[PDB]
Amino acid sequence: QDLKGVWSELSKIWEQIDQMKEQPWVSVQPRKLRQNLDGLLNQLKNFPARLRQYASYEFVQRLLKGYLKINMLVIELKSEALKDRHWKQLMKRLHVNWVVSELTLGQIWDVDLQKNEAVVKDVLLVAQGEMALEEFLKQIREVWNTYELDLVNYQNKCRLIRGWDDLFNKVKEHINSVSAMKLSPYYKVFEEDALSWEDKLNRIMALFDVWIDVQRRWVYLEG
Amino acid sequence: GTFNRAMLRLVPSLRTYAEPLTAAMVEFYTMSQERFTQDTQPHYIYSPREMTRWVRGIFEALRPLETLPVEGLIRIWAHEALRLFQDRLVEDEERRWTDENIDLVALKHFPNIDKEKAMSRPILYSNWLSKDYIPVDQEELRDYVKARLKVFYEEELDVPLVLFNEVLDHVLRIDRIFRQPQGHLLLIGVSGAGKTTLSRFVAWMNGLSVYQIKVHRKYTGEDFDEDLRTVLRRSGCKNEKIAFIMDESNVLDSGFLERMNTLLANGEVPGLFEGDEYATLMTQCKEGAQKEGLMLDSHEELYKWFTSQVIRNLHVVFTMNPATSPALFNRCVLNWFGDWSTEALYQVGKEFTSKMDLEKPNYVVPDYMPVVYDKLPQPPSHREAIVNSCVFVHQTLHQANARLAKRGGRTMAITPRHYLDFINHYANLFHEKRSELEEQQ
Amino acid sequence: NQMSTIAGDCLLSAAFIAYAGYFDQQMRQNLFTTWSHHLQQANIQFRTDIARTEYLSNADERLRWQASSLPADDLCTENAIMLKRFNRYPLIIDPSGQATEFIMNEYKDRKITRTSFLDDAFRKNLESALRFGNPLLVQDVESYDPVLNPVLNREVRRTGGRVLITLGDQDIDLSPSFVIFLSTRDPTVEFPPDLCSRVTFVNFTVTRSSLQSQCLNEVLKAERPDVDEKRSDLLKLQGEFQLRLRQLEKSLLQALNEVKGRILDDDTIITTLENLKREAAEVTRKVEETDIVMQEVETVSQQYLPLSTACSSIYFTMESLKQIHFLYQYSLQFFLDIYHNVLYENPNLK
Amino acid sequence: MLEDEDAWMRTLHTTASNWLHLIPQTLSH
Ligand SMILES: Nc1ncnc2c1ncn2[C@@H]1O[C@H](COP(=O)(O)OP(=O)(O)NP(=O)(O)O)[C@@H](O)[C@H]1O
Ligand SMILES: [Mg+2]
């Protein structure tokens, strides 16, 4: 009858839900996920009003609405900031025994993201701050691995160093920024690396602090 | 008249209307140029460039359509007149004058025409809900743009947006600009109105790639030239639509603006690509022409094709507050962002205070209620009264600043950002106090 | 009843936070009175006596502020409330610098950094604040650098998995723990409507009415200590007395949890209940006598109002004296020293 | 003005109007 038909439709809806859930977390695309979630909602609306009055249909419809509600958190979770350590923080706080390689969208959907919005948001703010730190360290490594001393010929006698102001500005800026990193609330994992860079930066500064001096004197003295 | 004959060559049914239409155009243009002068507002500049933009708009609206009646041609004439003349106007009486005279000029030069069919109060055009740039009703546009705002909440910015009448009108104006040949826009208006937000929203909505200049401490003209090289290389060679958005944070340097004017006017910057850069530009232009299906070989023809692609692909969106040369005003289509009206404030309040309870079943409607929103439902509910009070609070800040200015004191501007801040504070405080009392209970 | 009242209370409080803050004390009071009159005209229920400072703060935060260098004035407490519940980064307009020192003390545990717009190293420090998530107090905002517009407007672009903000030519990774406090020491400064939209103004400037209120409060504290205590009781009755009452209620519930034999070992536990009842009666009495005490304190305040107006006029004459000669530089603290000499260590009053 | 800020506008308006009245409008070359 009508109940048997709505039971059959319900099973078909759950088939689409389960096929959606079996998608591995690595290949989950949040935009296409939203597109498909909407399409599933449209299918529900297509059902006749008499079949829409059933409690199970309403439960599925509000569940799928919840999936689209936490879809935002799905884009926010499927980010490059989350790494493995922040996924380990969710792992620990969500008291769920997930496998990262075997992680699928279904496991995250079963966990109430709407109820645990605060947990996810907190982890994501930590991820944002620490990724800011990590990308600043990446900028330091890039600039100080590709930076070359500018040499200009000096009266066909030696190639002296030009660009002292630019080099000193860069060194001072990076030293100040590493010192500020040392005051960051997220300066826990990037401690050692920062320390090492600080040391290198200091040495650089120190070296050039004498180098220019020597150069200047030598120039004057040869004149 | 020559331009209109060339344009109406597509639809033979409107050929006999080439001579009258032009006259109407000319008359209205002259009227506006007499009525609105630069002494009132510095951007009230009119030139034959506006008439060319008028002809181009009618041409773009008539090109894909196989046939039109005379009423349709008059309707698109009025639409382009509104988009080119009424949009720049600051005060309400000027807009009313322009709207009334458009009808007078149309009928005067187009007698025996069904005014109702050729002229409805919400003249509206968009191809978002169809395949051609056909007239479209207000309601389905509102629904479609609300759906697209819901989409735009997830992708890109997450802060909510309210689609009231002014926002939707400006969205349609920016869309029209983004679908015009060398259509460059100048959003001039008060701070916090939503110029950047709506420009970026429409650019995302139409698929344009937003590119913004990043000026710095002693920004060099060579850096601006390199940025232009990249932008034009993407627009012309790569056939990529770009919304070149510029704000007063970098518009204030007129040295870059006067070089921007060449691209705004002609669609190219001669001397930008030279030597090796010109050779690579020609190579990539040849590759793009072959990809599109043109075997153009000569460098001059390749540069002409590149200029055409930049014309049809690159759109510049300037954003400023009410210095700027009148040439820049005349090169860009002018749009005005006024401070949010009472209806806009009421709509923003109702949308942003919808999650609140704000519902007292025993609320009593006070006789002679102080009303600031004229179209507020009578009798009001508790939520309607709350939003009315919010609008009144914003209006009282405006009146207080006016009184302080009259007395001679120093005053600060109350932008719509203040209203958004007030509504957000109301939401936070209401939820916080309710939560505190519920846990106490 | 407080359910019935919260809608109007929160509307008024949010309007006060978002809109007031640049205006002086009388102008804020005029705005609040206009809003209250409108809400009353529309039958929107709200408490007739909205104590904004006690509605938007608790005793703990106020005591912590007083531990910092926040002067104990109504204007300063309201300004601190705005500096707490702000959605837009505030612009402080103190002419003296007490508010800046208050901000430094409040965010000392968060490693707040003080910078100036005149400093050439400003932008760099700002970048660090944007990237590493540290509070930053930028002074000399009268020379505001428009490069801060994206930061104040929170215009962020979420490319990749990194959230960016365009500062100068460089895209800085914005950190969740970033907050910036703009500041200036010039009371007579005009800002573009752009900056006015991107910041919320918090004015600490001492005007005629602010100093008049300060002097009236100090007269009441010095010469009518009973009326000052009663007025403080009115301010505390807006939630502080009920807060301590419900804290004692929680303590009584905790003591009533451990009830096994020891409830009737002496059967004299009722004492604690009596204590609560006593204080309940006390606060109930303070609720019942509220109108009478309001009338009493208003009459006593009208008694000393002319002296307060005289003090305000005297101080502003002193301040304006600098136009006669360049040596006539008299600070507000100098007038306050004169005024405390007149009040407390006055041998004529003995 | 700075001693007492609140009357000054009306007085200044009257004074400037009187000054405009006394001062001749134009001087011939
Ligand atoms: N229709 C709207 N509904 C809700 N919020 C809006 C709307 N339009 C703009 N805003 C908000 O306005 C804020 C900032 O204003 P913005 O869009 O930057 O205006 P602007 O005209 O670019 N200001 P300025 O650059 O200072 O002249 C954002 O937080 C937007 O969310
Ligand atoms: Mg902007």
Neighbours of B381 (CB within 10 A): 15
Helices (H), B179-253: 195-205, 221-232, 248-251
Query: Within its chain, how far is the Cα of A60 from the centroid?
Result: 32
Largest CA distance in chain B: 83
After which residues does chain D break, using C–N > 2.5 Å?
6
Pocket probe for ligand 1: among B420, B422, B423, the residue whose CB has the most ligand atoms within 8 Å is: B420
User: CA-to-CA distance for B288 and A138, rounded, in angstroms?
Assistant: 36
Which of B381, B429, B436 to substitute to test the interface with C, most C CBs within 10 Å?
B429
Pocket probe for ligand 1: among B165, B197, B424, the residue whose CB has the most ligand atoms within 8 Å is: B197
The verdict on the CB of residue B158 being under 6 Å from ligand 1 is no
How many angstroms is the resolution? 3.5
Contact D5 C208 (CB under 8 A): yes
Q: Are C54 and C235 in contact (CB under 8 A)?
A: yes
User: CA-to-CA distance for B4 and B13, rounded, in angstroms?
Assistant: 13
Q: Touch between chain A and chain D (3+ CB pairs, < 8 Å)? A: no
C111: left (phi over 0), alpha (psi -120 to 50) or beta: left
Q: Cα separations (Å) of A192 from A90, A142, A202, C134? A: 25, 18, 15, 20
In this structure, is the dihedral angle defined by the CA atoms of residues B52, B54, B60 and B66, taken in order, positive or negative? negative
User: Is the minimum CB–CB distance between B402 and chain C shorter than 8 Å?
Assistant: no
Q: How far is the CA of C200 from the centre of ligand 1 (A)?
A: 15
Q: What is the dihedral of CA B209, B210, B216, B219, to 10 degrees?
A: 60
Query: Within its chain, how far is the Cα of B352 from the centroid?
Result: 24
The verdict on the CB of residue B320 being under 6 Å from ligand 1 is no
User: Is the minimum CB–CB distance between C285 and chain B shorter than 8 Å?
Assistant: no
Q: Are B80 and B57 in contact (CB under 8 A)?
A: yes
Q: Are A54 and A6 in contact (CB under 8 A)?
A: yes
- B424 neighbourhood in chain C, CB within 8 Å: 87
CA proximity to A194, closest of A140, A118, A125: A140
Query: Within its chain, how far is the Cα of C244 from the centroid?
Result: 22
The verdict on the CB of residue B194 being under 6 Å from ligand 1 is yes
Which residue reads 């610098």 in tokens? C97
Neighbours of B17 (CB within 10 A): 19
User: CA-to-CA distance for C292 and C230, rounded, in angstroms?
Assistant: 11
Nearest to A176 among C124, C133, C175 (CB): C124
Which of C211, C316, C324 to substitute to test the interface with D, most D CBs within 10 Å?
C316
Nearest C-alpha in C relative to B382: C44
Neighbours of A71 (CB within 10 A): 18
- DSSP annotation string for C45-99: ---SS--HHHHS--HHHHHHHHHTT--S-HHHHHHHHHHHS-SS-EEE--SSSHH
User: CA-to-CA distance for D14 and D29, rounded, in angstroms?
Assistant: 30
Query: Within its chain, how far is the Cα of B318 from the centroid?
Result: 11
Name the method of structure determination.
Answer: cryo-EM
Q: How far is the CA of B193 from the centre of ligand 2 (A)?
A: 9
Strand residues in chain A grouped as ranges (E): 150-154, 158-162
Q: How far is the CA of B196 from the centre of ligand 1 (A)?
A: 7
Q: Dihedrals φ, ψ of B189, to 5°?
A: 175, 180
CA proximity to B119, closest of B87, B83, B72, B163: B72
The verdict on the CB of residue C194 being under 6 Å from ligand 1 is yes
Q: How far is the CA of B17 from the centre of ligand 2 (A)?
A: 43
User: CA-to-CA distance for B285 and B287, rounded, in angstroms?
Assistant: 5
Query: Cis peptide leading into C71, omega within 30 of 0?
Result: no
User: CA-to-CA distance for B366 and C192, rounded, in angstroms?
Assistant: 41
Contact A34 B154 (CB under 8 A): yes
Closest-lying ligand 1 atom to the alpha carbon of residue B321: 27
- Relative to beta strand A158-162, strand A150-154 is antiparallel
Can you tell me whether residue B194 is helix, strand or coil? Answer: coil
Which of C119, C154, C175 to substitute to test the interface with A, most A CBs within 10 Å?
C175
Query: Within its chain, how far is the Cα of A80 from the centroid?
Result: 4
- A9-48 CB burial, b ≥16 within 10 A, e <16: bbeebeeebeebbebebeebebeebbebbeebeeebeebe
